[PDB]
Design a protein around this ligand. Structure first.
Ligand SMILES: Nc1nc2c(ncn2[C@@H]2O[C@H](COP(=O)(O)OP(=O)(O)OP(=O)(O)O)[C@@H](O)[C@H]2O)c(=O)[nH]1
Ligand SMILES: [Mg+2]
Lengths: 50, 241, 168, 601, 50
């Protein structure tokens, strides 16, 4: 029980550390993704000029 | 007029608030399971079993812990211990100092394999203009150490004023909703806009995952309006369309 | 044909089944895991009777007592209410009476009030006798049915009873 | 509360057994309900578990307690530890311990005070809650326990006490608990206690360098036919935007190039020369993105595609039909890496002056005009698309906005937030938005195809009216592209007129809130103008059948030419903007996409 | 108790987060490379030329 407890318990921290990590790059990717709207805006705007 | 405004020493009699529920830090189970902690190496031996906290509270003018402590009975933590007790101290309003502080702590109430859990908090009486009535309904945070939300002691809920910003915009609008502030519409469109405010409450609820709690109080006899017994010109703060 | 619109408010103690009742009526759905409502939810559904399409604008209120102070905003100008209790909970019925009282005192005098004795599928754990609830309903001109959002028993029927009583 | 006296009492000392006996009569006089009120005695008991005071008589009172203690909430569980002192005090402990162990054998064995944790059997707050509901019923409740001796174990007796009923718990799973745990004596002590229970029962910038004027609404305008009185142009380039001053209906216009083109309406009323030549110009030095007049002012605010924004003060003499001419940028506002999007400026009567413009990120940014500095910010979302129209409430309180995705979004400015969204199913990019008397309902100008207007009630979310040029009553998608692309003008006042461009037919229809049936259009048609504008119903909307006699339009080109030659006199591109002004009589301007204007009276 | 609560907590957090993450990343980036990288170019040609 003790060995496997330690093994099982401490790796949850490591697993969840990566889950928090996902939240970070996702925040960056959201800004990247937000620029898609900027590009869309520009295209739509000058297309409305067309 | 100030609803025919009258002084603090022109008041006379006891008080009766009310007291609701809380949003938890979740360190162990709702109600109780026997305290969840990986340092159980020693801690398991301490007979930690399922349990139930309670609390006690008194008051101090800091330097004298003046008030009578008073304890709590039982309600299921499935309710998040939502009491909505209406809760009273016979302390005549004139008997109350303008600078004084509440003192409350978690304790225990249902015979544990444990010793009765601490968990403090402290906060002030008066509003900015000194009237205790500024405190009437409110919210606060704290742990096994000790904290406040509206007037923070040193733990979860640790800064008071600037935290509310959009929530402070909600406080400014709460003063108008209280006054029935007359310069803007409150028709059924705005009634349904209050449906939208019911929505915004929940945003606050995410942020509430720290350690928050709900507090209440208001008068029996009404229309009436009052202030302190000494004077300063804060009433110069006034407005019109 | 003609369309008549009415604001309807759901009131009652938390967990009595207000959101379940309205989900059943609106969507023909029921979730064992229904989430407790925060604030109030807007829903709409119609019934048809006497060639009239009766469209309910429904405010499903959070029953939790902290939200009590918000209730008058949602029932102001409401032409119908359903006050819901849980038949397995006699205290939910005491709270239901106090909602009915508040409505008598503070709502529009014309309000058509329905009383729902919900969770009637759990009749073997009944705490509230049918005839007690009926006697209270009759005495106060409330439309009373025992309902079950779970099974759908009397769900459509209570909304139809309201529609019939409303001025059209 | 006030029965806490039970604790401090033990601080008074006496070793007279008589006192301990009066205390046994007091213990008899005291087995009490409140969860806390038991602990004052617990701790008196602690004094007594330091020093036992009355030997075997004490031992018997303790024995009486122990069987009741064989029932326990966890509220009782603190007393278990206290009770370990009573055996810890060697009475040959093990014989009395054995006798009592038989009397409370919830599990078979244990050891010292901490080792007291082991021999567990379950407490129950649950069935006791049911039992508190049953504080209502006693008698039969002492009659069912002896039958429970058989019903559990033996067969000595059976019961027919259904005369008392109360089946529901026995009918439910609550029946099970007695077989498992629940038993009679606890319930009799509890019944005693239940009887006890029963017994208890504004102008800081605007007056620095700007001038001032007051607004001038027309009379009801459904009555006049309009005859084309004048024709003119800003430049060949499309009109960047149009604005008409309240003062002298001073007419402001500009070329796409960023070159201004202004005129005096009273000069035109007099000299009549005004169509040939510009009254006033200004060098912007870049393409005009937007125009809006300063509310209550002669000043004019202009923004450029570089992000740069500025406010011109008017320098002019006051001589009849003869103003001196000079443009003067009085104040400047920053260009940025974020470019501009268009704006209207608002002095608020009994309240302050502010101007609001969208940034290139879509965000509304709302500057206090007097400060020439920001006062509020409201951020639009990539999901809505860009702004396709901008509108505001009468007191400015609710903003109303049409998106490039065919969603309508509103912002409570009183709360400084987007309130919510709606999106009429066809979800096309909104042309324009506006408000009418009966302010509760609002006009949306391009979602869906063959429909001219999807007028919808703001509180409802819903198209209370739907107007279509279609021969069929439902919205057959018979619209060419220009049917969805048009100018519109409405009045929340002034006898409730509405004017509407039909870009499919390139013409000005009229629709009078006073009479939809009698709505004589203001502008003509070459073939057949007359309109039987009769409203029908199909339940869900009060659909207006614009039965134009021989309109001659559909979703394809079934006529050889059908373009610029087919207009009431004054050939042109679609009416980009149409507006009413009232310098003497009421009269109207049509500004086309072609940098060209025609005036009607 | 340990095994249950950890099984409960880990499995839920993991499985939902795995599924939602795989989806939301997949979708957001695909949209860019399918559209940012395509629609924009298409409507640039019909902007500048046209
Ligand atoms: N057996 C049974 N369960 C029901 C019935 N109606 C609702 N429930 C359940 O009771 C619980 C609470 O139901 P809700 O609809 O969320 O209750 P509510 O009145 O809306 O509660 P609040 O939003 O907190 O005020 C959920 O688990 C529902 O699935 C019913 O008719 N029969
Ligand atoms: Mg609900």
């Amino acid at each position: 029980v003790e060995k496997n407890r330690k093994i099982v318990a401490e790796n949850l921290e490591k697993v969840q550390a990566e889950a928090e990590r996902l939240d970070q790059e996702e925040a960056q990717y959201q800004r990247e993704y937000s620029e898609f709207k900027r590009q869309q805006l520009e295209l739509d705007d000058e297309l409305k000029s067309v | 007029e100030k609803f025919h405004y009258i002084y603090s020493c022109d008041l006379d009699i006891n008080v009766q608030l009310k007291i609701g529920s809380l949003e938890g830090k979740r360190e162990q189970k709702s109600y109780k399971a026997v305290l969840e902690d990986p340092m159980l190496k020693f801690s398991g031996l301490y007979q930690e079993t399922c349990s139930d906290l309670y609390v006690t509270c008194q008051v101090f003018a800091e330097g004298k812990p003046l008030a009578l402590p008073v304890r709590t009975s039982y309600k299921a933590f499935s309710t998040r211990w939502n009491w909505n007790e209406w809760l009273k101290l016979p302390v005549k309003y004139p008997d109350l100092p303008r600078n004084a502080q509440v003192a409350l702590t978690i304790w225990d109430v249902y015979g544990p394999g444990k010793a009765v859990p601490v968990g403090g908090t402290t906060v002030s009486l008066f509003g900015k203009y000194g009237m205790f009535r500024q405190g009437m309904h409110d919210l606060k945070v704290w742990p096994n150490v000790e904290a406040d939300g509206s007037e923070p002691t040193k733990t979860p809920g640790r800064t008071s004023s600037t935290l509310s910003e959009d929530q402070m915009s909600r406080l400014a609008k709460l003063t108008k909703a209280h006054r029935q502030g007359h310069m803007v519409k409150v028709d059924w469109l705005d009634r349904l806009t209050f449906r939208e405010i019911e929505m915004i409450n929940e945003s606050e609820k995410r942020s509430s995952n720290f350690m928050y709690l709900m507090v209440e109080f208001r008068c029996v006899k009404c229309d009436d309006k009052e202030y302190g017994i000494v004077y300063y010109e804060k009433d110069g703060d006034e407005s019109s369309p | 044909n003609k369309i008549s619109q009415f604001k309807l408010v759901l009131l009652g103690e938390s967990a009595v089944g207000k959101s379940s009742l309205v989900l059943r009526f609106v969507k023909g759905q029921f979730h064992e895991f229904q989430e407790s409502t925060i604030g109030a939810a807007f829903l709409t559904q119609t019934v048809s009777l006497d060639d009239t399409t009766v469209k309910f604008e429904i405010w499903d209120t959070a029953g939790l007592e902290r939200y009590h102070s918000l209730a008058p905003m949602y029932y102001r100008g409401a032409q119908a209410a359903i006050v819901v209790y849980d038949i397995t909970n006699e205290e939910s019925f005491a709270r239901a009476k106090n909602w009915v009282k508040e409505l008598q005192r503070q709502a529009s005098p014309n309000i058509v009030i329905a009383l729902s004795g919900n969770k009637a599928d759990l009749a073997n754990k009944r705490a509230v006798d049918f005839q007690e609830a009926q006697s209270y309903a009759d005495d106060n001109s409330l439309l009373f049915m025992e309902t079950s959002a779970k099974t759908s028993m009397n769900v459509n029927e209570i909304f139809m009873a309201i529609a019939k009583k409303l001025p059209k | 509360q006030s029965s806490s006296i039970l604790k401090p009492l033990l601080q008074q000392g006496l070793s007279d057994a008589e006192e301990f006996v009066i205390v046994k009569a007091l213990y008899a006089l005291t087995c009490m309900c409140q969860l806390g009120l038991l602990q004052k005695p617990h701790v008196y008991e602690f004094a007594s578990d330091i020093a036992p005071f009355l030997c075997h008589p004490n031992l018997w009172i303790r024995y009486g307690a122990v069987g009741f203690i064989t029932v326990v909430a966890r509220q009782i569980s603190t007393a278990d530890v206290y009770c370990k002192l009573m055996p810890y005090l060697d009475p040959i402990i093990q014989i009395e311990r054995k006798l009592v162990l038989l009397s409370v054998l919830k599990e078979p064995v244990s050891r010292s005070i901490f080792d007291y944790a082991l021999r567990s059997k379950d407490i129950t707050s649950l069935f006791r809650h049911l039992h508190m509901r049953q504080k209502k019923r006693n008698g039969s409740l002492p009659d069912c326990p002896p039958p429970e001796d058989p019903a559990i174990a033996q067969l000595l007796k059976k019961l027919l006490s259904q005369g008392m009923t109360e089946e529901e718990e026995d009918k439910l799973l609550a029946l099970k608990d007695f077989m498992m745990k629940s038993n009679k004596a606890k319930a009799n002590i509890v019944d005693q206690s239940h009887l006890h229970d029963s017994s208890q029962k504004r102008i800081a910038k605007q007056m620095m360098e700007n001038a001032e004027w007051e607004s001038k609404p027309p009379p009801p305008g459904w009555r006049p036919k309009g005859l084309l009185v004048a024709h003119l142009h800003e430049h060949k380039s499309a009109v960047n935007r149009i604005r008409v001053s309240d003062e002298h209906s001073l007419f402001a216009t500009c070329s796409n190039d960023g070159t201004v083109k202004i005129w005096n309406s009273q000069k035109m009323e007099g000299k009549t020369t005004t169509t040939r030549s510009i009254l006033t110009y200004s060098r912007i030095g870049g393409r005009v993105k937007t125009l809006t007049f300063c509310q209550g002012s002669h000043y004019l605010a202009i923004a450029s595609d570089n992000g740069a924004v500025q406010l011109l003060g008017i320098e002019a003499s006051k001589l009849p039909k003869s103003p001196k001419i000079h443009p003067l940028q009085s104040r400047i506002l920053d260009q940025k890496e974020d470019g501009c999007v268009v704006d209207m400026h608002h002095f608020n009567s009994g309240a302050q002056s502010v101007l609001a413009y969208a940034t290139v990120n879509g965000s509304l940014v709302g500057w206090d005009l007097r400060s020439s500095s920001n006062a509020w910010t409201l951020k639009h979302d990539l999901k809505s698309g860009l702004i396709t129209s901008f509108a505001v409430d009468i007191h400015q309180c609710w903003l109303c906005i049409g998106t490039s995705s065919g969603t309508m979004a509103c912002w409570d400015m009183r709360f400084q937030l987007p309130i919510s969204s709606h999106c009429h199913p066809s979800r096309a990019r909104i042309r324009r938005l506006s408000m009418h008397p009966l302010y509760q309902s609002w006009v949306i100008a391009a979602v869906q195809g063959n429909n001219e207007v999807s007028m919808w009630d703001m509180e409802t979310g819903d198209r209370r009216f739907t107007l279509w040029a279609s021969s069929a009553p439902p919205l057959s998608e018979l619209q060419p592209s220009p049917h969805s692309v048009h100018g519109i003008y409405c009045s929340p006042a002034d006898g409730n007129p509405i004017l509407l461009t039909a870009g499919s037919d390139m013409k000005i229809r009229f629709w009078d809130l006073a009479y939809p049936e009698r709505s004589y259009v203001v502008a003509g048609s070459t073939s057949s103008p007359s309109v039987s504008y009769y409203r029908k119903i199909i339940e869900g909307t009060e659909v207006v059948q614009e039965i134009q006699n021989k309109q001659k339009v559909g979703p394809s080109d079934d006529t050889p030419r059908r373009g610029p030659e087919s207009l009431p006199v004054g050939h042109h591109d679609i009416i980009t903007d149409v507006a009413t002004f009232q310098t003497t009589q009421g009269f109207i301007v049509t500004a086309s996409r072609d940098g060209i204007v025609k005036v009607w009276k | 108790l340990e095994r249950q609560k950890k099984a409960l907590g880990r499995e839920v957090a993991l499985l939902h987060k795995q599924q939602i993450a795989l989806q939301d990343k997949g979708s957001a980036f695909s949209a860019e490379h399918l559209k940012l990288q395509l629609q924009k170019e298409s409507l640039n040609e019909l902007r500048k030329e046209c």
